[PDB]
Amino acid sequence: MNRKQIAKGKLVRRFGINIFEQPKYDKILKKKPHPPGMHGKARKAKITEYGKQLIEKQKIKFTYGVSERQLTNTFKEAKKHHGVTGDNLLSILERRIDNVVYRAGFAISRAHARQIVSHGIIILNGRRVTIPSIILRANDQIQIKEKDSLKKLIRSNIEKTSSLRNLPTWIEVNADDLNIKVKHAPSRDEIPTLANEQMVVEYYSKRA
Amino acid sequence: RENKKELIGKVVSDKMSKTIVVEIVQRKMHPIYHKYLKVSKKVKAHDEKEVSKVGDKVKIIEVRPISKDKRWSLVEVLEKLK
Amino acid sequence: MSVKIRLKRMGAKKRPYYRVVVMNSTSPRDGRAIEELGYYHPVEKQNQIKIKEDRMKDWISKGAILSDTVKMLLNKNNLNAKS
Amino acid sequence: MRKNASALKRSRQNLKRKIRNVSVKSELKTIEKRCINMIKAGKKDEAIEFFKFVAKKLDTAARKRIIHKNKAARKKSRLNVLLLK
RNA sequence: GGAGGAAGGUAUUUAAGGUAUGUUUAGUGAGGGGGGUGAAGUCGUAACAAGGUAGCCGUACUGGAAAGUGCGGCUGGAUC
RNA sequence: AAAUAACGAAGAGUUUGAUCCUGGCUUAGAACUAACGCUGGCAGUGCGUCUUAAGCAUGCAAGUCAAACGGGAUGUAGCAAUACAUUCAGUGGCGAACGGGUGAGUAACGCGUGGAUGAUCUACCUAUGAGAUGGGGAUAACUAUUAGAAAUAGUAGCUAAUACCGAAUAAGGUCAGUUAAUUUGUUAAUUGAUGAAAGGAAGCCUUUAAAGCUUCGCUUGUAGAUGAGUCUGCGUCUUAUUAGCUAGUUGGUAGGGUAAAUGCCUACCAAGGCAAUGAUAAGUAACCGGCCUGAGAGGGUGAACGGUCACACUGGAACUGAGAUACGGUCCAGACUCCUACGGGAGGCAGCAGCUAAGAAUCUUCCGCAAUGGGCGAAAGCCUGACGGAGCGACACUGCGUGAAUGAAGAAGGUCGAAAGAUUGUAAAAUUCUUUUAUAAAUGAGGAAUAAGCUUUGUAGGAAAUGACAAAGUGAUGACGUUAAUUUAUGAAUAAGCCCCGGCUAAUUACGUGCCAGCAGCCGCGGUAAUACGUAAGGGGCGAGCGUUGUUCGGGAUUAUUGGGCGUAAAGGGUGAGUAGGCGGAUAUAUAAGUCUAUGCAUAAAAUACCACAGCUCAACUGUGGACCUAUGUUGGAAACUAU
């Protein structure tokens, strides 16, 4: 995650939508609507269908901060089940542990939650885990490490994020114990929408 | 005695001694088009009694080798050519 | 050959698993299995032993030779089944 | 390559056993030959006696596993059948 | 004295080697033959219009060359 | 409106002044045991001479039994013997036919799968019926000696054994007759002929021997299990510009030989046998479970792993042995290498590492037998380059990090401009927070089971201990390893590049070059204003990787069974008569080869492939279950259609 050279203002500008849900990026959109580069104001020729599919794929990929190739594996796993492939894909992506922390509000951004989970702070179902690509299942627990500095850090984070964001109905958050409980896999309607998931599915159908 | 395989065929040669040649036709799959193909395979068979002659339909059984090629024995004559 | 009941190794580096198996002495450690009898998972904390008692008894009667490890697996499985 | 004491010893034992084996085998061949020749001579009674002797030799060797007991049995069959004639 | 036991001799079969004749296949070979690209060089103007002798097919003969002509066949032939 | 099922199929450029169709080429994707170029942090798992089956320095990879036997040497007791213990070689037992490597050869019962073996064998293992009574002769080792540089062969004398060879009786042996069954050489009974043998350690006590007894063994016999030989139905590459081939060739009668059938081999008797329904020949190739690709059908392919086969320098041959036509056994011939005292000898890394040569191209001359497996032994124990691990290579696969949160109408520079300003850009700077990784320390599971030995209980046995078995407890032992994981200590500290931007194909402007220099997969760009060349600024893609090349599939319905055509695009034979073959009116009955069904019942080893559930911090990876196809065999049915 060397994402120092992928300054996200450029991405939010090209997509024309705040895919990270951060007010600074809302402000950047307000200030400079045009796409990046010197030709940002220059009239752009019409985009091919391949371009639209790519735009949606990149929206999802940069929203969830997952390597494209890992996302390919995710789609290949989602397709293995019956049902709405887009729903399975979105559910698998959403149940990522760093994403779960972000939803619960224990972190500011998905990158922040990724660092938190990578730095060995999160405790999974009674054990320490250090990587952000865990796909939680139903009936699982996040605890916070037994260190006072970390506990105060998480409380500062949650007091910040509580106002800005909301708190999904498939997560049970207990700010007193710093406990997170995942009830069931999310439904499509209870997942915020930022891209056309079946355009993503169509894009990955080509890779066959 | 139990599962020795039996074959039914047409005697195509008799000018041997104590031996006949049986031409057997096997129906077989074609792996692709599924239509059958009639395959003609010729085997030698032991005929101790010179019972059978050219043109008739006989039945033969698997036995121990009796010669280099002869590995079948006569069991019965299903149809005798008049 | 001298039919023996032994452990055929499976699994990855530093995480062995064994299959309780019936197979000839001369046959390599991971070759043809005349029959399978169960599994033995030493790196697991639970369900470490599971063998087919009747089949193993039948093979012993036929004349198989138990390695020491499979012999004690049979003993320990008897103990845990009774318990 | 490196001379194995096992291999050298096995070669020595090979010669040792070969001498004894081949001696017994030649015994069998010649005794059998005398027997069939006076079967041909028709000397029924000492053909009897010599068949007794040769059968003794045959299955003595078979017990010693110099030759297979099936070989001994085959020789006895055929030779006794010829005397039956 | 069997034991012809065991060496030795003899004989059959046989590897390698030698000889002879055909046979499969890969390089090379004076010279010769056509093919392609580079030539937009030389000679002629055969085909595309009725291409200026309508065209073409099979066969035969002939000519620096495209080709010409005889016989039969076709329209996939203007014009009337 | 609806129900159910289906869980899965994308295009584009290019013939023309322009158009439609036909048609080839090219292209976006997924892969490989890959190589090369730029760049390069770590961890896990897997992989790593595809070419010269070319030649090989060196070390190791198969030994074990002293409780089978006679001796030598040593220490102790001993005067000497003899004992106790250690050690050496010899005789002998078992193993060495397993494990390991390679794919040269082999279009073949070799391989896959189902069977046949009344034509078969089978040491060690399990159960079990009977037994084990008495003699004799050599021989190594050893002591000398002959030939010899050594390798080594001999010679003479002495000695034992679970070594070798007779003898007495035999229990389910073999052979032959007879009878009884069974109907290829099967079984049972009778007679006749005829076949054996090994004892060593321990305890016991009549002093003891004796006598019986424990364990490991020996002779004979059967049964089971396992493996192997042989045969067979079916499947198993290309070229018919390979058309005739075979003369032990085809079959018969005897015989040779084999565990066993057969021209497997030999002697005679016939001329037969195979072949356009593809014989024979040439070329290529180990096969299969599988792998890659694909919606599927198919196509390509046979890395790793597992099974079978073949080979171990080239070409033969036999011996020992239950088992070999024997990788590190023997003999011979040939080439090559090496040592000679010139008489002659020694050697085969396609075992684990490693060297040279070849090649675009591939590793350490490492640790350990702790676990698993194997060999020997009563056991302790020994051996195990199998295997457990480590090191090396971004070679593939999987995961993680290189920061995170605030942060300006917006720093300097760079670039575009009319020199308002834009863009790089909240990016940086700055502030705050965190420590996966980095370093240090502490803590630290699990792979491990116990073995010998010891304690105790119970069973068989018996006069009884020693011992055997069943059970309980005690009982040394980790190469990996500074293990996985966990807890503190310091701080943004240790960490990004590569390709592309005319269309295909997501991404444009400014300079320099002027049909030169160059790009290119296709169409094609460059001749004085190049979004296509070269360099900068921006933008897109992926990321410790990114591109290129080689090979396979897909897009290609471009070999079309699913699913294409033949008037003019490539494609109807000049025409007819007919052989083989394919196909064919109506209707009745029977057979059940095809077809369908009970997705009966089995077989299709394991792994892999699909679906769930689990364990490695997750994933890869690993494990336990559950199935979907369709392939063969078989059982009982249905009969319309094809077939009889």
Bridge partner residues of B44 (DSSP): B21
CA–CA dist A79, A92 (Å, integer): 11
Q: Give the nucleotide with minimal C1' distance to the Cα of C3.
A: F226
C:6-65 Cβ neighbours of strand F under 7 Å: 6-19, 24-34, 39, 41-44, 61-65
- The conformation of residue B57, written as its DSSP 8-state character, comes to E
CA–CA dist A75, A70 (Å, integer): 9
User: Chains meeting C at 3+ CB pairs closer than 8 A?
Assistant: none
Q: Which of A67, A64, A66, A74 is nearest to A21 (CA)?
A: A64
D:47-66 Cβ neighbours of strand F under 7 Å: 51-52, 55-56, 59-60, 62-65
Do residues A13 and A33 touch, judged by C-beta distance below 8 A?
A: yes
Cα→Cα distances A92→A18, A200, B57, C36, Å? 22, 14, 70, 38
CA–CA dist A3, A64 (Å, integer): 13
- The conformation of residue B72, written as its DSSP 8-state character, comes to E
Bridge partner residues of A124 (DSSP): A127, A142
SS (H, E, C) chain D: CCCCHHHHHHHHHHHHHHHHHHHHHHHHHHHHHHHHHHHHHCCHHHHHHHHHHHHHHHHHHHHCCCCCHHHHHHHHHHHHHHHHC
Do residues C17 and C70 touch, judged by C-beta distance below 8 A?
A: no
A:28-47 Cβ neighbours of strand F under 7 Å: 28, 31-32, 34, 36-42, 44-45, 47
CA angle A157, A162, A166 (to 5 degrees): 125
Do residues B37 and B28 touch, judged by C-beta distance below 8 A?
A: yes
Strand E bases contacted by the protein (CB, 7 Å): 3-6
Phi, psi for residue C51 in degrees, rounded to 5: -130, 160
- The conformation of residue A45, written as its DSSP 8-state character, comes to P
Method underlying the structure: cryo-EM
Bridge partner residues of C21 (DSSP): C6, C36
Q: Give the nucleotide with minimal C1' distance to the Cα of A156.
A: F433
Whether the beta carbon of B1 falls within 7 A of nucleic chain F: the reply is yes
CA–CA dist A8, A21 (Å, integer): 12
Distance (Å) from CA C45 to C1' F269?
A: 82
CA–CA dist B43, B39 (Å, integer): 13
Q: Give the nucleotide with minimal C1' distance to the Cα of D26.
A: E5
Protein residue ranges contacting nucleic strand E, Cβ under 7 Å: D 19, 22-23, 26-27, 29-31, 34
CA–CA dist A45, A122 (Å, integer): 47
User: Chains meeting B at 3+ CB pairs closer than 8 A?
Assistant: none
Amino acid at A82: H
CA–CA dist C17, C10 (Å, integer): 5
Q: Give the nucleotide with minimal C1' distance to the Cα of B12.
A: F273
Phi, psi for residue A28 in degrees, rounded to 5: -60, -45
